[PDB]
Design an enzyme around this catalytic site. Structure first.
Site, short mmCIF file in Angstrom:
data_model
loop_
_atom_site.label_atom_id
_atom_site.label_comp_id
_atom_site.label_asym_id
_atom_site.label_seq_id
_atom_site.Cartn_x
_atom_site.Cartn_y
_atom_site.Cartn_z
N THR A 10 0.69 -1.30 0.21
CA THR A 10 0.01 -0.09 0.12
C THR A 10 0.82 1.21 0.09
O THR A 10 0.51 2.24 -0.28
CB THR A 10 -1.02 -0.19 1.12
OG1 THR A 10 -1.64 -1.45 1.25
CG2 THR A 10 -2.18 1.19 1.12
N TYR A 52 6.79 -13.52 -8.37
CA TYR A 52 7.29 -13.57 -9.64
C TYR A 52 8.13 -14.92 -9.96
O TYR A 52 7.95 -15.63 -10.91
CB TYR A 52 8.20 -12.30 -10.21
CG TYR A 52 8.38 -12.65 -11.60
CD1 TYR A 52 7.31 -12.52 -12.61
CD2 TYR A 52 9.91 -12.93 -12.04
CE1 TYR A 52 7.64 -12.53 -14.10
CE2 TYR A 52 10.30 -13.08 -13.44
CZ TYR A 52 9.10 -12.76 -14.34
OH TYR A 52 9.45 -13.07 -15.76
N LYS A 95 0.19 -12.86 7.68
CA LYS A 95 -0.98 -11.70 7.07
C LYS A 95 -1.65 -12.82 6.06
O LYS A 95 -0.82 -12.99 4.93
CB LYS A 95 -0.38 -10.51 6.75
CG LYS A 95 -1.29 -9.77 5.89
CD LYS A 95 -0.76 -8.36 5.55
CE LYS A 95 -1.57 -7.66 4.56
NZ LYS A 95 -0.60 -6.35 4.05
#
Ligand SMILES: [Mg+2]
Ligand SMILES: [Mg+2]
Ligand SMILES: [Mg+2]
Ligand SMILES: [Mg+2]
Lengths: 296, 297
Positions: free
Chosen positions: A46, A109, A164
């Site tokens: 964020t 990735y 998380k």
């Protein structure tokens, strides 16, 4: 284990004329502290960590640490990479800059195997003596930390104390806490903050709390105090804004909302992030009107 | 009109020995590709573990590739991409400055830009150099997709952008692309479906399998480019088993394992978070290789 739990905010990083607005950054963290937040997460997703230089990483972490000093609000620094050698270095830097712990995203990735994920996080945990929270977000990374891997890391490494989860998978949240109830499961998905807490999760790392820190902190504290009726009520009220803040990729909508609320001076991103479409700009603005936005 | 880099191309592995890039091995592997019909080599892409190499190692690998291809027809299409546009522009400028013939630029991973952001990202890259730029779409790794509309706009609006390497398992999108913009160079980024992509008008491959079997991938591509589809399809069918086993774990774990098993590299070394495959997959790879003739040095 040492833990960092409760209501936490994945801080946006305001830009002004291409540079980090360090005063705005400090004012926003102080605003979080005044509205019941338990910890702040600088330079995460964020916060546009991908487009910040290392010196800007250090600056934001230092501003967070020193703005929270003496207030009991903790700093859970974003410190992760898809290269283990680099992730270890970022963990050490974050410890040196005064962070109370680190949030370390699963390698993006390059899609490591579960064995590779284990060795990755084990190298990170052994490099510092501060808490490490795993971060699972397969829609962004292309890989998933399996429940077995998370549990093995929790049990084998002293510093690793939970995860998380931003995976839209409440079944996995049941899986985790049924087989390892000592871990700290942290919600990384605002719309389902209450379901994760009501199953025994112990905190949130929130996007919405940038805009509505009082509402997200209240939600979390109601839930931790087992007032599920009141926690669910806030979660239900927040659903519309929780969804519109992802009508385009986070943090494009949340920065737009902070700008619309007068909480940041300029709606500036670093490419490849950019302003939302005019349609989504209008949708965000209209959804915000239903909510009382705390000032500074 | 546009300058292009097409044909049979190899996503080069990066050999490690005692934690460092084995620079002699890297040069010897590139020469082996050249001598087996490959038209271009791709240093420090995903198959080359770009994520865990330092920039100095990025420069070294590109310089070795550029130097080894001098005096040949083989082009160097350098991996030069990032999820930060400022960094991707610099890597593109650096790849050109180091002598690369073009760049392969992967779509921003992890931060999920919008289509507008992807357009501005690649336009900034394309305007920073004067060498060809090939887009790279691999949504399973990046978490985003360059839409057909975005690819075509970039091809039409940016001089240097000449096509896309697709690794999306989506032959429908391949039809969509070449039906609405038949001038672009569609490049297969998925070895198992090299022939279907070529037979619809694709003009090349960027291959994992060609690290091990460069002569076969080169033959497949050049048969297909000459519209000898029966010969190209026969090779594609024969290659299916190895094309699939080379992804039994995340690329480049299987291909490096196969190269080590063939004696083409000295050490089966990765940089974390990549590591050796499971013993079961190690054995599966070894078994499939026995059905193929592997060229030496
Ligand atoms: Mg508190
Ligand atoms: Mg970097
Ligand atoms: Mg060497
Ligand atoms: Mg011919």
């Amino acid at each position: 284990k040492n833990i960092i739990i409760g209501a936490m905010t994945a801080l946006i990083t305001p830009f002004k004329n291409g540079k980090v607005d360090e005063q705005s950054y400090a004012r926003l963290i102080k605003r979080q502290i005044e509205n019941g937040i338990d910890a702040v997460v600088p330079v995460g997703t964020t916060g546009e960590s991908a487009t910040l230089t290392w010196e800007e990483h250090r600056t934001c972490i230092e501003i967070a640490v020193e703005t929270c000093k003496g207030t009991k609000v903790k700093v859970l620094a974003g410190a992760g990479s898809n290269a283990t050698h680099e992730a270890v270095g970022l963990a050490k830097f974050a410890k040196e800059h005064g962070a109370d712990g680190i949030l370390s995203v699963a390698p993006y990735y390059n899609k490591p195997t579960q064995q590779g994920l284990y060795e990755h996080y084990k190298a990170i945990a052994q490099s510092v003596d501060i808490p490490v929270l795993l971060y699972n977000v397969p829609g962004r990374t292309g890989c998933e930390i399996s429940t077995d891997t998370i549990i093995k890391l929790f049990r084998d490494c002293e510093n690793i104390y939970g995860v998380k989860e931003a995976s839209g998978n409440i079944d996995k949240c049941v899986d985790l806490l049924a087989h390892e109830p000592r871990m700290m499961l942290i919600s990384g998905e605002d719309a389902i903050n209450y379901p994760i807490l009501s199953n025994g999760g112990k905190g949130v790392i929130s996007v919405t709390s940038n805009l509505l820190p009082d509402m997200i902190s209240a939600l979390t504290h109601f839930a931790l105090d087992e007032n599920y009726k009141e926690a669910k009520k806030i979660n239900d009220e927040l659903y519309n804004i929780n969804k519109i803040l992802f009508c385009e990729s986070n943090p494009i909508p949340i920065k737009t909302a902070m700008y619309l609320a007068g909480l940041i001076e300029s709606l500036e991103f670093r490419l490849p992030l950019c302003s939302p479409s005019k349609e989504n700009f209008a949708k965000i603005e209209e959804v915000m009107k239903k909510y009382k936005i705390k000032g500074f």
